């Protein structure tokens, strides 16, 4: 391919706006997996994250294993559609022995997901497949302030070649500050010495200033210091905003100041949803099927 | 009177049925699809026969209507001819006309048929001559001048082009002509005659050569405008004058300017009328008999 | 005096905070800290001892267990735990039938154990039933919500219902204990206290100045906790229970109750 | 707003960039005979100059590869020619390397698909094939009604009227009305832009596209130099919509339905090549 200048305007440049219009006309799709201990808040985050307290109320098709559960939804909003599709762990952690056996349905589920996507791949009479591989791996760190446990490192080894991981600390409200910026640096510490690799949001060219500065920030603030809570409270200002409201304050979701829950929502769903299914499709499926036929 | 005949050769889409209605000045010959001497100076005597054809088994002739379920049809190759009579100075001019050349897949019939068929009218005048019981007032049929309809590519003459035209000077005199030429600008026209002069002098295709010495100015005038470019029409405007009539402006064919229509009319009908007559009957007519006789 | 305590929880639970924040001193550290290779190299519960004297001249004994609910495999996390309190008890019982005793024995016994329970909402897990079931009957067991402020107060109350609930349906024997020998006033005051367990706690070693005033406490980019303050946690409740008002009956309790059913067992069988 | 609203309206621009970022791929095959404005076209719809013996040809592919840029947008420009088709006295299976070039780049990618490891992908599938048809003013010919037939069943098939300003406004009805009813006729199916729609409906009205192309421009009358065909009997403006159907048919390659060619050769023609071929 050679280069040649071009006088005035052709409109070849319209074909991202015709892919703009298309992706209105069909909707979009987007499947998460939650992993934590119960009662870690994965069901408040997911409710908190798409204003929806019925994210979990459609559940789609002695115990020694994880349990997964898969709920599906769809979210209008300005004439754009999703078909949500959230992954549920049950019963991770609390099992007296932990081992790989315990929570391997997750990485099952995953593997089935892309063993699917393959198969309608390779099918002679190949029609359109709906998109089912999971395309963020949200895993929830409990807020004890001092490091990732070691059921935290296995797993997160076990899934950051096969999900986008996005590592989070859960219910943060409780932790000041320092204890906040001091978990988060151990915890990065450690994922660098176990060589776990997490989802980098990517650098636009000829993109604004503000634009790569935020993708920068959302990679450089991981793990997150995220709260949830779908329900309205009082400030003691008056204002009604959505939070929690203890004897010793009212903590604010939607408010910079409090947590990352601002840089979760940007990275899983306002600014880095499809760069995740990119990633997911493009490199994750990819190396999983290279592994697979090779 | 002077016997004439006038052989109009070409692939379709040519101009060639516009050509013979504006020469007559009425609308004898229709188009194609759309199968009466309005001129006092012109009268039918023997209207169009076919003299030669070569087609499949059922395949529709020239004069079917449009048929879409037969287009994918090879129509072959036919010849035709008309006898009109024109104004002794009477003319007794039989025009002759091929149909389907450029439309099959493979147009080696066409050439096959077009020196069958002149072949056969020299045939017919040595048998004549030859016979005990003559007749000097004999129906001549060979044919005098032939215009062959050059295509308006804007490259130079294919390989159809020099097959036909060498094909047809073995028995008459041959014009190549530029068709359409309101198909090209000023600039386009000239370099489309130089590239057509070139591939006549690459090939050896024996056209015409327009040649006391009082006749210098105009025959050489002659061979300046070789092949001669001619923009035709056969219907007229309001005022009765032939016109071209597109979105952007009017041809006027009477205009000298833009085509040499005028100039091949009077070089048929006056000066070599003639000039190709005695070329065909005492020298090709001559060589072919010699040949004959060896 | 002698007073034994242990503090049984998963690391990063608050319980070398809680112990320093009820003693008023800085009598123990955080067995792992921020550090994961700090736990036992073992992958098992060990014992952390620590010998310390406050002023009555209180010579305080901190058992902390580390290990217990920090690894992949917790399936004898507490074992350990078992093993030492009844190794107490068993050493206790052979002073005892020396036939040239000790006027002063020294006790060794765990008087007290503060349970750190995750405040995470749910019923008892396979480890906190297994360990409840054992402890509870060899030795005085205090539950307590670890981190108590992760729930609000409508949380707490739910999360505390479930956990009596929990003890109700397991059997678990939860100090204080009521016997016939108490009068009204003490078993109204059992009653109350029983109420208000397992304790929503909240520890803090560092002070805080909320409007020009000194507390103990801990403050957030959102919150302001004053743990001396009953209306935030029950950190008083829990101070005054196990310093003032039973800290005669643990270390009575410990002796007649859970020491002399290990020696009448332990009897019995040889 | 309580509650902030998710993102989820921010999803169609967050696609924009990925695909603003990935660029873009076109493959445009330019099939007919010889003097016919192909060159020429090809010239005037990308605004630059991508393409500048023997009397009997052999009828062959010419890959012309070009990468244009336009607002930061990259276009990699695949142009396939094919010199010698329909230029000769026998002209019989002329269409055959064509169709087998179309075939050929189907069973590359299909092949490349299957590979163990497929990073890097060759992707020559053409998206659209132009059929130049010669304004003879009459019909489609029996070479142009095969090649069209083998054409469409493998590629978007884009009949066009070459050199449209040598025919009159009536000319020009009555060809487009014969061509339109022997493409009907013989089952022959050509691209149509989705219906979702009265901008589409009147691109579907034109076809097959007139076609005039010019590399010059000339003042319009109003002091505005305008691509344009200068006669000396007028100025034949390719953008002016009543001289010629260039505006269309670059709606239908590249400023509106680039995204529709490019899907539908690779979800119909090259999913249905796939299927028979494993078949
Ligand atoms: N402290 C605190 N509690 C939370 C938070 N999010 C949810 N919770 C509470 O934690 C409990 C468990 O939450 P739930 O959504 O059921 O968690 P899951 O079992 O992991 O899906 C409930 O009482 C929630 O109200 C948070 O950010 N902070
Ligand atoms: N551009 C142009 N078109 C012409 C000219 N003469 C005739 N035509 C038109 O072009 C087509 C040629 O058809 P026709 O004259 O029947 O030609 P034939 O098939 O060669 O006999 C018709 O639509 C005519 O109206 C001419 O000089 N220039
Ligand atoms: N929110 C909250 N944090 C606490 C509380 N008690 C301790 N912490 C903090 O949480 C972490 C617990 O660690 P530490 O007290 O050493 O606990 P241990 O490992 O269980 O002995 C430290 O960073 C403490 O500052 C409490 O009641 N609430
Ligand atoms: N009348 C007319 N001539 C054109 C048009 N487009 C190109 N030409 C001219 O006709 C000839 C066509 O040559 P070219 O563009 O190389 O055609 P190709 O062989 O089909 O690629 C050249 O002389 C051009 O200047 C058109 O739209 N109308
Ligand atoms: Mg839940």
Redesign the pocket.
Not at chain 2, 152 to 155: I, L, R, V
Not at chain 4, 162 to 166: L, S
């Given at each position: 391919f050679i280069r040649r200048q071009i006088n005035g305007y052709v409109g070849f440049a319209n074909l991202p706006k015709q892919w703009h219009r298309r992706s209105i006309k069909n909707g979009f799709s987007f499947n998460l997996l939650c992993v934590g201990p119960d009662g870690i808040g994965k069901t408040t985050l997911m409710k908190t994250l798409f204003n929806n307290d019925d994210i979990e109320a459609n559940l789609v098709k002695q115990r020694h294993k994880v349990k997964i559960k898969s709920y599906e939804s769809v979210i209008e909003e300005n004439g754009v559609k999703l078909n949500l599709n959230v992954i549920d762990t049950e019963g991770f952690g609390d099992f007296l022995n932990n081992d790989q056996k315990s929570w391997d349905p997750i990485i099952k589920e995953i593997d089935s997901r892309f063993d699917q996507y393959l198969d309608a791949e390779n099918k002679i009479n190949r029609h359109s497949i709906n998109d089912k591989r999971i395309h963020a791996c949200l895993y929830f760190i409990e807020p004890t302030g001092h490091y990732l446990k070691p059921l935290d490192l296995k797993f997160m080894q076990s899934v950051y070649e096969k999900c986008n991981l996005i590592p989070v600390i859960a219910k943060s409200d409780i932790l000041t500050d320092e204890e906040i910026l001091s978990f988060k640096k151990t915890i990065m510490n450690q994922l660098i010495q176990s060589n776990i690799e997490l989802f980098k949001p990517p650098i636009y060219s000829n993109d604004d200033a503000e634009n790569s500065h935020l993708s920068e920030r959302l990679f450089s603030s991981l793990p997150y210091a995220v709260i949830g809570s779908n329900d309205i409270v009082e400030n003691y200002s008056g204002n009604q905003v959505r939070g929690r409201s203890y004897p010793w304050g009212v903590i604010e979701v939607d408010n910079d100041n409090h947590s990352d829950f601002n840089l979760l929502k940007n990275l899983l769903i306002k600014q880095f949803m499809e760069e995740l299914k990119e990633r997911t499709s493009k490199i994750l499926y990819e190396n999983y099927r290279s592994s697979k036929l090779a | 009177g002077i016997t004439y005949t006038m052989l109009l050769c070409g692939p379709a889409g040519t101009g060639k049925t516009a050509f013979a209605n504006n020469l007559l000045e009425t609308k004898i010959f229709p188009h194609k699809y759309q199968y009466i001497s309005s001129n006092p100076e012109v009268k039918v005597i023997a209207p169009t026969k076919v003299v030669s054809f070569n087609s499949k088994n059922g395949i529709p002739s020239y004069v079917s209507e449009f048929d879409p379920m037969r287009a994918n049809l090879e129509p072959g190759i036919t010849i035709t001819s008309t006898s009109l009579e024109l104004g002794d100075d009477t003319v007794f001019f039989n025009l002759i006309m091929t149909h389907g050349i450029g439309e099959n897949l493979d147009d080696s019939l066409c050439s096959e048929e077009v020196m069958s068929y002149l072949e056969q009218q020299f045939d017919i005048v040595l048998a004549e001559e030859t016979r005990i019981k003559r007749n000097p007032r004999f129906e001549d049929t060979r044919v005098h001048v032939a215009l062959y309809f050059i295509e308006?590519?804007?490259?130079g003459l294919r390989e159809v082009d020099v097959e036909l035209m060498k094909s047809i000077s073995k028995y008459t005199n041959v014009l190549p002509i530029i068709t359409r030429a309101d198909?090209?600008?000023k600039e386009?026209l000239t370099?489309?005659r130089k590239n057509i002069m070139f591939d006549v002098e690459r090939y050896n295709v024996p056209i015409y050569k327009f040649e006391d010495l009082e006749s210098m100015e105009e025959n050489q005038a002659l061979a300046s405008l070789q092949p001669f470019a001619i923009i035709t029409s056969d219907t007229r405007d309001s005022e009765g004058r032939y016109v071209r009539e597109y979105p952007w402006g009017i041809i006027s064919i009477d205009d000298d300017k833009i085509s040499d229509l005028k100039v091949l009319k009077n070089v048929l009908f006056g000066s070599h009328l003639q000039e190709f007559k005695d070329t065909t009957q005492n020298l090709l007519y001559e060589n072919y008999r010699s040949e004959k006789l060896s | 005096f002698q007073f034994n305590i242990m503090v049984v929880g998963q690391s990063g639970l608050g319980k070398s905070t809680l112990i320093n924040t009820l003693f008023a001193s800085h009598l123990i550290d955080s067995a792992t800290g921020d550090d994961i290779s700090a736990l036992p190299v073992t992958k098992t519960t060990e014992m952390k001892i620590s010998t310390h004297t406050l002023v009555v001249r209180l010579n305080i004994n901190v058992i902390d267990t580390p290990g217990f609910g920090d690894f992949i495999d917790n399936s004898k996390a507490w074992e350990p735990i078992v093993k030492y309190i009844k190794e107490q008890h068993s050493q206790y019982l052979r002073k005892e039938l020396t036939a040239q005793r000790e006027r002063f024995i020294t006790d060794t016994r765990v008087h007290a154990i503060l349970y750190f329970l995750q405040p995470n909402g749910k019923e008892l897990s396979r480890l906190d039933v297994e360990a409840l079931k054992r402890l509870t009957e060899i030795a005085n067991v205090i539950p307590v919500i670890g981190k108590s402020d992760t729930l609000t107060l409508d949380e707490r109350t739910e999360f505390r219902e479930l956990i009596q609930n929990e003890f109700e349906k397991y059997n678990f024997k939860i100090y204080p204990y009521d016997s016939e020998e108490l009068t009204d006033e003490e078993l109204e005051l059992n009653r109350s206290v029983r109420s208000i367990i397992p304790f929503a706690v909240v520890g803090s070693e560092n002070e805080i100045e909320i409007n020009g005033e000194t507390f103990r406490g801990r403050k957030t980019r959102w919150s302001a906790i004053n743990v001396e303050d009953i209306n935030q946690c029950d950190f008083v409740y829990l101070r005054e229970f196990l310093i003032r008002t039973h800290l005669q009956d643990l270390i009575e309790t410990t002796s007649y109750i859970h020491y002399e059913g290990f020696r009448a067992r332990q009897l019995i069988a040889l | 707003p309580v509650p902030p609203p998710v993102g989820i309206s921010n999803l169609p621009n967050q696609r924009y960039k990925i695909v603003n970022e990935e660029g873009g791929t076109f493959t445009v095959m330019?099939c007919?005979?010889?003097?016919?404005?192909?060159?020429?076209?090809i010239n005037t719809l990308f605004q630059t100059v991508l393409?500048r013996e023997p009397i009997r040809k052999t009828v062959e592919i010419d890959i012309t590869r070009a990468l244009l840029e336009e607002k930061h947008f990259e276009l990699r420009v695949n142009v396939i020619?094919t010199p010698g088709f329909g230029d000769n006295v026998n002209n019989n299976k002329a269409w055959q390397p064509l169709v087998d070039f179309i075939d050929d780049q189907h069973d590359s990618y299909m092949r490349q698909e299957q590979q163990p490891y497929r990073t890097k992908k060759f992707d020559l599938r053409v998206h659209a094939v132009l059929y130049?048809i010669r304004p003879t003013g009459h019909g489609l010919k029996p070479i142009d009604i095969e090649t069209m037939k083998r054409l469409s069943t493998r590629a978007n098939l884009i009949p066009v009227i070459?050199?449209?300003?040598?025919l009159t406004a009536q000319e020009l009805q009555q060809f487009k009305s014969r061509i339109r009813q022997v493409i009907e006729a013989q089952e022959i199916r050509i691209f149509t832009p989705p219906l979702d729609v009265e901008h589409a409906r009147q691109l579907i009205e034109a076809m097959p596209f007139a076609?005039?192309?010019?590399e010059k421009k000339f003042d319009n009358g109003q002091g505005t130099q305008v691509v344009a065909?200068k006669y000396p009997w007028g100025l034949?403006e390719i953008e002016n919509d009543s001289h010629?159907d260039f505006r269309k048919l670059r709606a239908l390659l590249l400023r509106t339905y680039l995204l529709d060619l490019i899907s539908t050769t690779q979800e119909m023609h090259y999913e249905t090549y796939r299927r028979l071929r494993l078949e």
């Open positions: - | 308006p590519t804007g490259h198909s090209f600008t386009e370099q489309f | - | 330019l007919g005979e010889s003097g016919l404005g192909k060159t020429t076209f393409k020619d130049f070459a050199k449209a300003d040598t076609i005039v192309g010019s065909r034949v010629c």
